[PDB]
Amino acid sequence: ADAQATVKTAVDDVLATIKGDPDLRGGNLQKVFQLVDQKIVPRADFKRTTQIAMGRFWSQATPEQQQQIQDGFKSLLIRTYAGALANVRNQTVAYKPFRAAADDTDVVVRSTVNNNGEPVALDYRVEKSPNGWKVYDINISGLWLSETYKNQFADVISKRGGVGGLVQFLDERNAQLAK
Numbered sequence: 001a002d003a004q005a006t007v008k009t010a011v012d013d014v015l016a017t018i019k020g021d022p023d024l025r026g027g028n029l030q031k032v033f034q035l036v037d038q039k040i041v042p043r044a045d046f047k048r049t050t051q052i053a054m055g056r057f058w059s060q061a062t063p064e065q066q067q068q069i070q071d072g073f074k075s076l077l078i079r080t081y082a083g084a085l086a087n088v089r090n091q092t093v094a095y096k097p098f099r100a101a102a103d104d105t106d107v108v109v110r111s112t113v114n115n116n117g118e119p120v121a122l123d124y125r126v127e128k129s130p131n132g133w134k135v136y137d138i139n140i141s142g143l144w145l146s147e148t149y150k151n152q153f154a155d156v157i158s159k160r161g162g163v164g165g166l167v168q169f170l171d172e173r174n175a176q177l178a179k
């Protein structure tokens with residue numbers, strides 16, 4: 001499967017799984033985490049997303065901090081979008097032309113979700129790894145998440161004096177979202 005096929009298959013899997021599970025649609029958060037782990041993670045490279053978000057500070061973090069930040073960032077995103085996922089009912093997705101070369105290894109896949117009549121643009125950055133195509137970024141409301149969080153994280157690291165500050169910030173954000 002090429003980049004666009006990988007994205008299409010994964011997104012269809014997510015949509016079909018939600019539509020078949022009333023408990024997830026009812027807002028069961030544990031099940032949303034499980035959905036992400038089973039249906040998204042195997043087709044994603046979230047370590048790369050986290051690396052991009054940390055920028056020059058990635059190398060400054062201990063291996064343990066790197067894991068904690070990836071886990072906290074992942075939790076932050078799942079909790080942020082859990083409502084949107086649970087609210088899925090009839091959404092379908094159309095793909096725009098794939099414009100990169102077949103031999104390119106870092107590409108963009110562009111799509112439009114029909115959200116109850118409202119076009120919702122979702123684009124994806126996809127990289128071909130030794131173990132297949134993996135999504136490492138998503139574009140929502142015109143913005144690449146890795147870029148938004150790169151800027152947000154750099155600001156936190158600046159104001160709080162380092163990587164430890166970012167861990168603290170992610171803990172705060174996850175606590176706020178849990179409420």
Ligand SMILES: CCCCCCCCCCCCCCCC(=O)OC[C@H](COP(=O)(O)OCCN)OC(=O)CCCCCCCCCCCCCCC
Nearest residue numbers: 014036044046049074077078081084115135136137138140
């Ligand atoms: C970094 C790698 C990411 C890989 C992700 C690939 C999988 C894509 C799956 C896409 C499913 C789209 C369903 C939404 C459809 C919709 O229609 O949502 C409709 C809503 C609008 O809702 P509303 O009309 O109620 O208005 C709300 C006001 N009442 O739009 C949105 O909130 C914006 C789009 C949200 C898209 C969410 C995608 C999931 C984010 C990733 C979470 C996992 C991160 C952890 C990574 C390991």
